[PDB]
Amino acid sequence: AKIKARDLRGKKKEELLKQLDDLKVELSQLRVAKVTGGAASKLSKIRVVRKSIARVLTVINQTQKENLRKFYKGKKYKPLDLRPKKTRAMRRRLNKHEESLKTKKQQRKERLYPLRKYAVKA
């Protein structure tokens, strides 16, 4: 009676689309019944069918994008949807490597004169 997202994950796309179509036709029948005058039991089911449709569509989209990004993880250029989505400012900062690397003159200087741990007697 209740369609849940837990057991829809293992199923593949074809029967998911078939179930979506069945839910859509059931929703259309519910709407026409509401217009022509139906029981409160049929009126209440409209929300549950809408939410079941939402669940099916959400599962479809989630699996599709998971597979897409899994397939694209091994490539240099990714679609903007699959690229990380943080603030525009943080997206154009220097990355960790080019933020950490140092000129070899400074490398030489800090190698020759490192900071020392020390204390002075009172």
Partner: protein, 86 residues
Amino acid sequence: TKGTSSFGKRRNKTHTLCRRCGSKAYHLQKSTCGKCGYPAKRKRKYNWSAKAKRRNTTGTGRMRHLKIVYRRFRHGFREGTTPKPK
């Protein structure tokens, strides 16, 4: 003649609805909004009227993306991960 009699002749409008700010201030003949200056890239905003500035400022509308980033910020813009399943 300059008053009540003249008031009967007005039957064509000067402004219409702006396509950007939504107010009825789009002068047709000048093709320009008198509230936001729609054809211009930058919005019309003078700070000699703080009331006008506060009528249509950032905090007035839906804030449908800034509201979300305000709470995304409280976790360091965590992304690409999910909580541990049951």
